[PDB]
Swiss-Prot record:
Loss of function: phenotype: Deletion mutants lead to ferritin accumulation and iron overload in the retina leading to retinal lesions.
Additional facts recorded: Belongs to the T-cell and airway phenotype regulator (Tapr) locus, a single chromosomal region that confers reduced T-helper type 2 responsiveness and protects against airway hyperactivity (AHR), the hallmark of human asthma. The human genomic locus appears to lack the Timd2 gene.
Assigned protein family: Belongs to the immunoglobulin superfamily. TIM family.
Disulfide-linked positions: C14-C86, C27-C38, C33-C85
Domain Ig-like V-type: start-end pairs: 1-102
Tissue specificity: Expressed on late differentiated Th2 cells. Expressed also on all splenic B-cells, with increased levels on germinal center B-cells, in the liver, especially in bile duct epithelial cells, and in renal tubule cells. Within retina, mainly expressed in Mueller cells.
Localisation: Cell membrane
Designated gene of the protein: Timd2
Stated name of the protein: T-cell immunoglobulin and mucin domain-containing protein 2
Purpose of the protein: Cell surface glycoprotein that participates in iron homeostasis in the liver, the kidney, the retina and oligodendrocytes by acting as a receptor of H-ferritin. Mechanistically, mediates iron-containing ferritin uptake via an endocytic pathway, trafficking to endosomes and subsequently to lysosomes. Plays also an important role in the regulation of Th2 immunity. Receptor for SEMA4A involved in the regulation of T-cell function, enhancing T-cell activation.
Residue positions with a glycan: N63, N68
Domain of life, source organism: Eukaryota
Self-association state and partner proteins as the record states: Homodimer.
Length: 107
């Protein structure tokens, strides 16, 4: 489980090769990948920029068009803990990443 600290940002890595996958859309969602995928969406990109976001705390601060679609959750709270899913819609070879985030109250 990725460890986070309340009051600080936390980043969940999600990266893919655009050389082999092309520049494609991706989404982040709350929940485990096989039970929700992106039904409870946090982020949607069109491959180049974020086109949908649940709220401003969910940011893609990396170079999106170069494959870095890692999610940074700003100003985390213990309540942000839980499962997260990244889905990169690479035609014919979707990439999935499951994370269990644990944000500690202090430390």
């Amino acid at each position: 489980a990725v460890q986070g600290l309340a009051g600080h940002p936390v980043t969940l890595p999600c990266i893919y090769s655009t050389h082999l996958g092309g520049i494609v859309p991706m989404c982040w969602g709350l929940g485990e990948c096989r039970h929700s995928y992106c039904i409870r969406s946090l982020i949607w990109t069109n491959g180049y920029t974020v086109t949908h976001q649940r709220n401003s705390r969910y940011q893609l601060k990396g170079n999106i068009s170069e494959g870095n679609v890692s999610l940074t959750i700003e100003n985390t709270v213990v309540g942000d803990g839980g499962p997260y899913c990244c889905v990169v819609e690479i035609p014919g070879a979707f990439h999935f990443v499951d994370y269990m985030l644990e944000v500690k109250p202090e430390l």
